[PDB]
Design a protein around this nucleic acid. Structure first.
Lengths: 25, 91, 197, 97, 127, 214, 97
RNA sequence: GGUGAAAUUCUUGGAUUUAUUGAAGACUAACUACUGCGAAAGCAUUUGCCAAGGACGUUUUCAUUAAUCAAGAACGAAAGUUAGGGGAUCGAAGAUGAUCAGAUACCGUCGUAGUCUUAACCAUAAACUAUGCCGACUAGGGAUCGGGUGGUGUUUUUUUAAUGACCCACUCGGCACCUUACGAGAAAUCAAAGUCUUUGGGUUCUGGGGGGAGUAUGGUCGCAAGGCUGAAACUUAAAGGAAUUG
């Protein structure tokens, strides 16, 4: 882990989660 | 009051044409509407008579300019280039 | 009408018999009524002056350029277009110009063009926003609108048309060696897909 | 460095603004200096120069438009031309500029 | 009393271009490279094949007329390493010991007044 | 398959008369063929040659010169000046840390329309009795020095023709007069022109060339 | 911890200087951080200087000296023996030899 | 060509290499420093123009107008976004040749977005001096940048007789640096991180074990990317700093 790639994995996950949220909106 | 937040003059289009198109035309439509400087009398009388024509309400001088500005950036740099080049030509 | 660039109704005193002949220029940026357009090879290098391309120095911005002397204007006549004078050749009496399509054309040094970019620049950078403005744009030019796609037409009406699925079917890039009625699509396409890469 | 010399006059000296008052003073002979903005029409500036030649007065050409002339004089409108009837303690009368 | 050519020698890694031309700089006389002499894919940059390239250059600049040569050493330059490779000194020694007289040695490596981006990325090469 | 050296005649180059020994070097193109003779394609060459050879003395080991050939007579090529340049080794040796170098350049046309862009170099000088380590200039000494050199070079050139221009560049009087005008302003170590490049060549006017060659 | 008083470089009062590239690995290193060596290297090595002296044409010739300013990322600088890892107490030394 | 060793690639139609150039775009090498400027991010070609600025000089002027700063605002590297131009090099992605057991990686070749610019966004960086800002004092030194003062000092056409650079000695300001720590600190270290258990100069922000987690959610700002704000459930007895021995 780095302070860069835990962050990037979290951001990929966050984009997927906001996509699913908007899809369910 | 603040009748509208950020559509501005493009609020007449309502909800149509897409917000990006409306933003792209808003910056041109404010320009082709705002009264401009007059290089011949120094008054805010200049208005776009037609696409490329900028009449002064007073002193009845009209300038051929940009379709959405009294003088576009390429026109400004051409006038600068001509001035500079005639400056070397003359001296 | 049917032209973005405004015209300058210039009047010239007729040199040979007493009258005023009214000529129609394509206006450049910065020309105004009550301005003395100076046309001729001895004229000064100002905006609006008509200068034979020998007189102008290299790197100048000229417009409404003659292809050959006497043609009365051919190049860069649409709104906001210009031609850059890049070369002078007194040995061959020819001037090399960078030209709006990116071409580098050699034209005679006797050819002349008005100095400065053509007025009405930036016209196409505002979208028409609707078929109303598009229609009124083409109503002053010619009958070329609306423009039906060839796919939607029937096989009689177009090479593309037909099929149980709306599709071109064959390669769209038509050869330049094709004949009238075949040149429907991409003509002599040296390359296809997105430019710049 | 003309604006401060003008500011001395606008406070202490005597002056008139505008083409009509300028020519009125020029034909009366009272005016000693007239400043003409560049923005002013060439016909006006040329006839004012001709009047000045007839009256043997000196003409200063402003390095700016009539807006600059108006602000420099201190009046928030546009002044094409300014006439200096009786300057104050300003040295512009004995100054070429 | 001796005719002057120009060696225009280009010694970088992976090559030794021993390219003799006339003094006017347009007409070449035996452009020879170390890649022409060795069949092992890294002897051309070796000091040996630089000596072979300059050796055959000397051999066929003799009996042709050229006697003295202005050697113009040059590194890869450009945006590249811009240091003369191992073929340089060996090729110069070869020209010197092959009787071919040498005059006006100088380094004509092309130095940028500022270059474009160098190949390799920001982190550069990683070995 | 057959050596193309068998069809060469080993022509010769001839320097302008304003130098030392005219013999500069040989050259070669080909035999004389009906399609392509030896005189047709020969013209247009640039001979790049050390000024040490053109001057017969060692003091000009750097300061190389470019001579451009114009015509041919018999086995002789008549060359004309094109432009000079300091050797890279001399340039690098001149530039060292702990001093500011001044580089100037002015582009003017001579008496004859040989427009040329003369350059000039100069270095800030640590005079004796100085204990400071670097002796940098003040960015106003740079401005003043390149102003005075810009006017000095435009005095030396555009006031004469290429013949006298070369015949005065080689003796290095221009740089000494630069020192004359500069020593009051700032101490500088070795002012050098360091470069000149012709840009445009007008009508070929062979009369002057024949005068300079013979 | 802070292994060096001046972190790795000489940047006191700049914030940003300029990147440069290593002559070996083309690594983008700030020019003040890079290990600069001024390669004052002649053309012909001393085992061939006399060889070229006899093979030459000029009775006295200058033997030109090539100059080249080498910028090194420290990753290859200490890999190529140019500079070396010193002791903690000897790190304070800044002598050229 | 290129490499640890090659290959993919270009090549008898002439590759690579040479000379004349021409064109385009980008960068401003060397000079270039324990140097300068800037609020920071940043800023290295010339000149011109426009304003701006600090330091110094000042027996100038005003007279407390000041310091810090929630809210709010300007600027804010790179990458990224938007439309237009240009588009050379490099080069995410990609395609590929290698190596490996595998290698959609490191290495090689090409190559899109980008890299540049115009006009708009974003508003984050190990945005670092990881040291808030303002003020005083406490220890010495030697350099250096900018300004100023003095020398019957050196030095330049004329050998004090038309004047800068330098040298010496100061002084203000700046980037810093070297020694010692009297002092401080957990120590590394520090001339401020000192004047703090002999604890109170003024003032803003932040932290309260580690994870979860800068996450969920809500809100707001953004075209989006995302930014700012920001938990808890549960879980754990260590995480961590600096030095010592191995």
């Amino acid at each position: 882990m780095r302070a860069k790639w835990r962050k990037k994995r979290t951001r990929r996950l966050k984009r997927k989660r906001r996509k699913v949220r908007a899809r369910s909106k | 009051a603040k009748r509208t937040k950020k559509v501005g003059i493009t609020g007449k289009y309502g909800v149509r044409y897409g917000s990006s198109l409306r933003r792209q035309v808003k910056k041109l439509e404010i320009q082709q509407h705002a009264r401009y400087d007059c290089s011949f009398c120094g008054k805010k009388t200049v208005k776009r008579g037609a696409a490329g024509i900028w009449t002064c309400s007073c002193c009845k001088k009209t300038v051929a300019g940009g379709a959405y500005t009294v003088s576009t950036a390429a026109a400004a740099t051409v006038r600068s280039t001509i001035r500079r080049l005639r400056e070397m030509v003359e001296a | 009408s049917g032209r973005g660039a405004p015209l300058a109704k210039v009047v010239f005193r007729d040199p040979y018999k007493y009258r005023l002949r009214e000529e129609i220029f394509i206006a450049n940026e910065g020309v105004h009524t009550g301005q003395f357009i100076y046309a001729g090879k001895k004229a000064s290098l100002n905006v609006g002056n008509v200068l034979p391309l020998g007189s102008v120095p290299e790197g100048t911005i000229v417009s409404n350029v003659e292809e050959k002397p006497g043609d009365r204007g051919a190049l860069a006549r649409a709104s906001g277009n210009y031609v850059i004078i890049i070369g002078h050749n007194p040995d061959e009496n020819k001037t090399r110009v960078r030209l709006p399509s990116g071409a580098k054309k050699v034209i005679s040094s006797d050819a002349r063009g008005v100095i400065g970019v053509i007025a009405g620049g930036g016209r196409v950078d505002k979208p028409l926003l609707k078929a109303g403005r598009a229609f009124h744009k083409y109503r002053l030019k010619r009958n070329s609108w609306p423009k039906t796609r060839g796919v939607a037409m029937n096989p009689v009406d177009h090479p593309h048309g037909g099929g149980n699925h709306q599709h071109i079917g064959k390669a769209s890039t038509i050869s330049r060696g094709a004949v009238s009625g075949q040149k429907a699509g991409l003509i002599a396409a040296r390359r296809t897909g997105l430019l710049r890469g | 460095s003309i604006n401060q010399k003008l500011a001395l006059v606008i406070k202490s000296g005597k002056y008139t603004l505008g083409y009509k008052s300028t020519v009125k003073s020029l034909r009366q002979g009272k005016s000693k200096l007239i400043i003409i903005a560049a923005n002013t029409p060439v016909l006006r500036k040329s006839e004012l120069e001709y009047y000045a030649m007839l009256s043997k007065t000196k003409v200063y050409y402003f390095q700016g438009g009539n807006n600059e002339l108006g602000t420099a004089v201190g009046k928030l409108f546009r002044v094409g031309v300014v006439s200096i009837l009786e300057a104050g303690d300003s040295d512009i009368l004995t100054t070429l500029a | 009393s001796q005719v002057f050519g120009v060696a225009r020698i280009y010694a970088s890694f992976n090559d030794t271009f021993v390219h003799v031309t006339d003094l006017s700089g347009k007409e070449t006389i035996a452009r020879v490279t170390g890649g022409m002499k060795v069949k092992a894919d890294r002897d051309e940059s070796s000091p040996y094949a630089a000596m072979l390239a300059a050796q055959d250059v000397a051999a066929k600049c003799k009996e042709v007329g050229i006697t003295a040569v202005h050697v113009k050493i040059r590194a890869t330059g450009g945006t590249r390493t811009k240091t003369p490779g191992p073929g340089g000194q060996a090729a110069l020694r070869a020209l010197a010991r092959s009787g071919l007289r040498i005059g006006r040695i100088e380094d004509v490596t092309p130095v940028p007044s500022d270059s474009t981006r160098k190949k390799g990325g920001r982190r550069g090469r990683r070995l | 398959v057959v050596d193309p050296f068998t069809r060469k005649e080993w022509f010769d180059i001839k320097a302008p008369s304003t130098f030392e020994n005219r013999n500069v070097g040989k050259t070669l193109v080909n035999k004389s063929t009906g399609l392509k003779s030896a005189s047709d394609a020969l013209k247009g060459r640039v001979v790049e040659v050390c000024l040490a050879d053109l001057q017969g003395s060692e003091d000009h080991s750097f300061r190389k010169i470019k001579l451009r050939v114009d015509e041919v007579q018999g086995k002789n090529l008549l060359t004309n000046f094109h432009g000079m340049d300091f050797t890279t080794d001399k340039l690098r040796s001149m530039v060292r840390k702990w001093q500011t170098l001044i580089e100037a350049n002015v582009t003017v046309k001579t008496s004859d329309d040989y427009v040329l862009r003369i350059f000039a170099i100069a270095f800030t000088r640590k005079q004796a009795n100085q204990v400071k380590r670097h002796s940098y200039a003040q960015s106003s000494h740079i401005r003043a020095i390149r102003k005075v050199i810009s006017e000095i070079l435009t005095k030396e050139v555009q006031g004469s023709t290429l013949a006298q221009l070369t015949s005065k560049l080689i003796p290095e009087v221009i740089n000494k007069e630069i020192e004359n005008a500069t020593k009051d302003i700032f101490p500088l170590q070795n002012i050098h022109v360091r470069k000149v490049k012709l840009l445009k060549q007008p009508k070929f006017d062979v009369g002057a060339l024949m005068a300079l060659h013979g | 911890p802070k292994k060096r008083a001046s972190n790795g470089r000489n940047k006191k009062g700049r914030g940003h200087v300029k990147p440069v590239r290593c002559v070996n690995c083309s690594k983008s290193i700030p020019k003040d951080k890079a290990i600069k060596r001024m390669a004052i290297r002649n053309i012909v090595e001393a085992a061939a200087v006399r060889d070229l002296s006899e093979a030459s044409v000029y009775p006295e010739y200058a033997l030109p000296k090539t100059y080249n300013k080498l910028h090194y990322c420290v990753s290859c600088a200490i890999h190529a023996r140019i500079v070396r890892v010193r002791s903690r107490e000897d790190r304070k030394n800044r002598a050229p030899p």
